[PDB]
Amino acid sequence: DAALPSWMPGADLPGYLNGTLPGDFGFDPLYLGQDPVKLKWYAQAELMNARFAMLAVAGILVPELLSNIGFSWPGAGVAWYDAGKFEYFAPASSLFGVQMLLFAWVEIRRYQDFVKPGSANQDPIFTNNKLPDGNEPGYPGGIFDPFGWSKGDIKSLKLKEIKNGRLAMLAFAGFIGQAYTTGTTPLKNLSTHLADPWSTTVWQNDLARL
Amino acid sequence: RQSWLPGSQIPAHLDTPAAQALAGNFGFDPLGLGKDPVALRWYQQAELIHCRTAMAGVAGILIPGLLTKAGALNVPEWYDAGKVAIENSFAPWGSLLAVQLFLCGFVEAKRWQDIRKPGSQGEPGSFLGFEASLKGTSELGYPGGPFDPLGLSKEADKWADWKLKEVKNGRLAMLAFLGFVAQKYATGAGPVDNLAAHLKDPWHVNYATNGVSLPFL
Amino acid sequence: KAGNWLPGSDAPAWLPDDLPGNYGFDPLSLGKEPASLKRFTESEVIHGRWAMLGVAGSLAVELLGYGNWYDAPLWAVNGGKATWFGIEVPFDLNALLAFEFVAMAAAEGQRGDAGGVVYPGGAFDPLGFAKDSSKSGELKLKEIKNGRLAMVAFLGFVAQHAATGKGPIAALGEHLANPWGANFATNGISVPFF
Amino acid sequence: DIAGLTPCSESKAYAKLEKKELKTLEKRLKQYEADSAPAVALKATMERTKARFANYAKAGLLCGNDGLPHLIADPGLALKYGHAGEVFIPTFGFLYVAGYIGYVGRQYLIAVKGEAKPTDKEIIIDVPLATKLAWQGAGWPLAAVQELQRGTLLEKEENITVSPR
């Protein structure tokens, strides 16, 4: 209900989205963020899902990009969906248990800081090490930002982060869809489409299987 | 005011402030079984127990069944899991049922006494000091203490929402199990098999073509 | 207080500050009433002492080469004679249950008749290590912490045995030999999908 | 099995009776044509007789020395030898419908008793109220148990007239 950017110029956006959260464009046709507590939780959920999707898309696209060139390493021809049944130094079960314990520790710490901001900024072992007092949930800083990049325009950088995260989330969804339909890696699908985009579309490929 | 039938006359016994405090109040009572407040309270407890039991059972039927469709698990069908489980078991079904009846009767009798007198299970010097945690909250059917270890019921802002997510889901589960029985007597396969068979051809594989649900057609 | 189990959380008001091992850990509010807290405190100290004795016995019996803790009463299942430190004992299972029952009943009855005493002293402390009440609070914290660790260790003993089949000493050597290849995730029952 | 009886699927008198009924029907059919109304009706009766005998034998009924089915009324024997469909399930079915009718009638009487002329409503039935009560009577056992537990099902002794003894 202001001059803030909108996802539909002229549309009547809801009033609970006043631009406080980063990347607010008034996009909520299902009104899932009506409840303030639900919206507060969904903001953190969007941030976490966005960051994990960004790391995932980077970790899916980088090995395939380096595999298509002269760079070589042990796991090169293995696809992202085939990396699970790969021979590593430890079995998948052991790695899963180790990561479950480590993620349990960091996620409980993050949840503790979410329910009480500033209550988890202190290092339990080294009492001298701590995060700055000024902090918000989902934006830890301190050791997490050693370069001090947040000292500048925190609003523009947060907007860039949420936009890149939404794009990466859609990219991961597209990765799942392309792997389930074409049954081939995403960069190979991109190359196939770039060879002749007029005859290689979702409609043509899906109609050829109907 | 949400209603189960837009335009229908909501019963007066379901419009009182005490009845409106119950979760999932949609004014659905055509038979008028909840006219008596005591009967309404008893039926509310019965609905809560049915919701939780149906949710646990339907989850135990759907999740292992869905994992069996893939290569995650190999759990047999719900209508055949009892025989398979009792075959390679350490006890017959009768002895197991007797132990189960005793263990369930103890907790059900304690819950019954709490229904008859709320907070009566907190009688000092009666349950080895654990009686202090056996007192429920101000709402019947929603106890704390040992139950709810995460303490998600302490926040009132989401409390009214949480209960709405428990009854509704439970009601859905109550229907799910019912379908699980009807489908078993109409197709002879499991629920996941029926879902896949219907998804393969919904215009010809449904209850209108099973030859049982429509005997006149 | 001894510390904070959950950093950033406030300690419960029903837990006294002078209570040994008071980390403010009570999410279920079991010790909310003062009458229940006393019984639970005595029960926790007794459990810690019994667990310390049990874990020490299991570790010593498996380290001295006299089998593990699980195979100790197997002599009375297939016919045999119990041996303590390699010395034969002529007491059968029937005479052991009666003597242990009488001795434990008398000792526990005498202990319970005192009105729930956690720190009797006197005859139970002939060396006088806790004669002064100033250092009593520090040693009590060590006792409750070692007891809690022993309780956790005994639960781990039972769980790891039911999951693998070997004893605690044999499981430690296997894990030291292959840490990534031998753990709870590779037993086959802790993680079902993997 | 029970009481020295034999199952109808193995009784010789049962099959003999079926043959006798089919024989008299066929004898009556022998005097008509092959594509007429009495022939079709007799053939339909014969098919109904065969289906009835096969359905009674398939149900697991017990036949006596006369070849006729015998019902088991004891709940223990019926539930132990698979005879609950004879006298047990129909017992509860009748109890449900009978209590349904009685509860609907009682509710109608209590509803019209608080009006100006209850006798007028007794001779001229109020169709909307009767239909509403008839539809609401599906939960008659639960409602009856609740009325009995609250003490509103019965009337006090001081409010009921009696003779001078």
Swiss-Prot record, chain D:
Keywords assigned by UniProt, alphabetized: Chloroplast, Photosynthesis, Photosystem I, Plastid, Thylakoid, Transit peptide
Subcellular location: Plastid, Chloroplast thylakoid lumen
Gene Ontology CC terms, in alphabetical order: chloroplast thylakoid lumen; photosystem I reaction center
Signal peptide range in chain numbering: none
Major localisation: plastid
GO terms, biological process: photosynthesis
Similarity remark: Belongs to the PsaF family.
Function: Probably participates in efficiency of electron transfer from plastocyanin to P700 (or cytochrome c553 in algae and cyanobacteria). This plastocyanin-docking protein contributes to the specific association of plastocyanin to PSI.
The protein, known as: Photosystem I reaction center subunit III, chloroplastic
Organism: Chlamydomonas reinhardtii (Chlamydomonas smithii)
Taxonomy of the source species: Eukaryota, Viridiplantae, Chlorophyta, core chlorophytes, Chlorophyceae
